[PDB]
């Protein structure tokens, strides 16, 4: 303690923003960060008393959010569910709800199942002014809102960088190569 | 049969333990040359007769297993021992010792194995005069028999 | 092979059983190849004997 | 076996199963490939022997 006090003269503090960044920077619905000083201690702690700290603003979960222009970051980590974007033909002017839950059983369009699972991400309603076969994101982590930012490849690379993901991929490859070796040694 | 193969292997080991002599050494050198040229380095698919090709392929498989594979295994064991000693020294996994000692051991045990089953491999060449390989093997066997003053088959 | 071939793995998952054993499956496949080598060698030897 | 015996007990990573109803559709047909393969192999071997 006391000696620690001495070491307090030179000890330095470091911010904790690491690998996540300022969410308020990326999510428009996320309010800017605030620092709240707790109120002074209450003199009498009563059983029926309530907390007196200042209240944070109430931000209800939006049912759907507008398609951020390529600057959309995931609210909560969604299901992977696929490593290949889907080339869907959309008619012009038709408001389609790109699913964000990742558990939507109705393909690229939102299935409304998002309202039944514990997650922060809500479907994004988008409208294409020109009809055509557009590549809708299936990685669920594309910076472009409805469009696949080819970040499926980045997610696949990150998974392959992980030890467990590398082990799984190499095991699948090894089983395929074992079948291949059996075929090669079949005629012998 | 399997008993015949076991007896042949044991007799070969016993003979290699007993000695290699001088006339026997020269005959072994000649037989090794013949096996290397007409069998080991000659693709069995090139032979005219299909039966000759089959017999040469059987002999080649025997050489690949009894000589090449055994020598590779002995060299790999020597390489594993050397690499274990080296990793013990440096307290880390090296890369050169594995391949280097594997190649050295393959080169070393390659002749010794060829020294043991020299006769046995020759025994796989007696196709008969109906094949060109058979005629050449008969000539080589006649030369070896003249050298050794003994009638082989 | 696995969830990759399907476009909505969650759906695919449920569409089989509504249960998840994926990591078990991957580790099992690796170990299965690594073990399946030896029985293959033994069966090759036995088949050669039968052909003889 | 290992996963159930190491991370499924009450004192080791229990799971709260919120499963009102099952919704499987192709599970039986998908898993039936293994029985089908065995049946085909048995039938082929018998037809060859018989």
């Amino acid at each position: 303690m006391s000696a620690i006090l001495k070491r307090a003269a030179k000890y330095k503090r470091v911010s904790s923003i690491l690998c996540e960044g300022e969410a308020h920077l990326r999510d428009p619905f996320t309010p800017p960060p605030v620092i709240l000083k707790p109120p002074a201690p209450r003199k009498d702690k009563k059983p029926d008393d309530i907390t007196d700290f200042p209240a944070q603003k109430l931000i209800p979960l939006p049912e759907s959010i507008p398609y951020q222009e390529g600057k959309y970051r995931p609210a909560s980590i969604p299901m992977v569910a696929g490593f290949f974007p889907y080339n869907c033909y959309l008619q012009q002017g038709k408001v389609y709800s790109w699913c964000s839950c990742g558990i939507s059983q109705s393909g690229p369009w939102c299935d409304g199942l998002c309202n039944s699972v514990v997650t922060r991400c809500r479907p994004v309603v988008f409208n294409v002014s020109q009809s055509g076969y557009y590549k809708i994101c299936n990685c669920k982590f594309s910076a472009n809102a409805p469009f696949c930012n080819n970040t499926h490849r980045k997610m696949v690379r990150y998974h392959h960088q992980t030890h467990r993901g590398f082990y799984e991929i190499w095991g699948a490859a090894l089983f395929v190569l074992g079948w291949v070796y059996m075929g090669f040694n079949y005629y012998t | 049969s399997c008993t015949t193969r076991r007896f042949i292997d044991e007799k070969e080991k016993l003979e290699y333990s007993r000695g290699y002599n001088q006339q026997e050494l020269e005959a072994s050198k000649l037989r090794k040359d013949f096996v290397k040229k007409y069998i080991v380095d000659f693709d069995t698919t090139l032979y005219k007769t299909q039966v000759e090709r089959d017999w040469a392929y059987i002999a080649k498989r025997e050489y690949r297993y009894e000589v090449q594979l055994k020598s590779i295994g002995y060299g790999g064991a020597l390489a594993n021992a050397v690499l274990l000693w080296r990793i013990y020294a440096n307290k880390k996994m090296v890369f050169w010792p594995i391949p280097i000692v594997g190649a050295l051991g393959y080169l070393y045990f390659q002749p010794v194995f060829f020294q043991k089953s020299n006769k046995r491999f020759f025994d796989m060449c007696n196709v008969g005069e109906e094949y060109y390989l058979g005629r050449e093997r008969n000539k080589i066997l006649r030369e070896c028999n003249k050298i050794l003053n003994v009638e082989d088959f | 092979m696995g969830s990759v071939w399907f476009r909505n793995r969650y759906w695919w998952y449920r569409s089989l059983y509504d249960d998840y054993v994926a990591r078990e499956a991957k580790l099992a496949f690796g170990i299965a190849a690594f073990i399946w080598l030896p029985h293959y060698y033994w069966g090759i030897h036995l088949n050669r004997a039968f052909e003889v | 076996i290992l996963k159930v015996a190491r991370f499924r007990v009450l004192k080791m990573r229990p799971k709260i199963s919120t499963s009102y109803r099952p919704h499987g559709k192709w599970g039986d047909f998908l898993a039936c490939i293994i029985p089908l393969i065995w049946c085909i192999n048995i039938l082929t071997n018998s037809n060859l022997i018989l």
């Binding site: 059996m182 075929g183 040694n185 079949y186 005629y187 012998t188 | 039966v51 089959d54 017999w55 392929y57 059987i58 498989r61 196709v127 | 293959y40 069966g43 090759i44 088949n47 050669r48 052909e51 003889v52 | 393969i37 085909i40 192999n41 082929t44 071997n45 060859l48």
Partner: peptide, 21 residues
């Protein structure tokens, strides 16, 4: 059996060479 049931075809097995005089 199957297309690949024994998983190994011993093509090396050659016809037994007759050795009658």
């Amino acid at each position: 059996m199957a297309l690949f049931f024994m998983a190994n075809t011993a093509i090396s097995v050659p016809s037994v060479l007759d050795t009658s005089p």
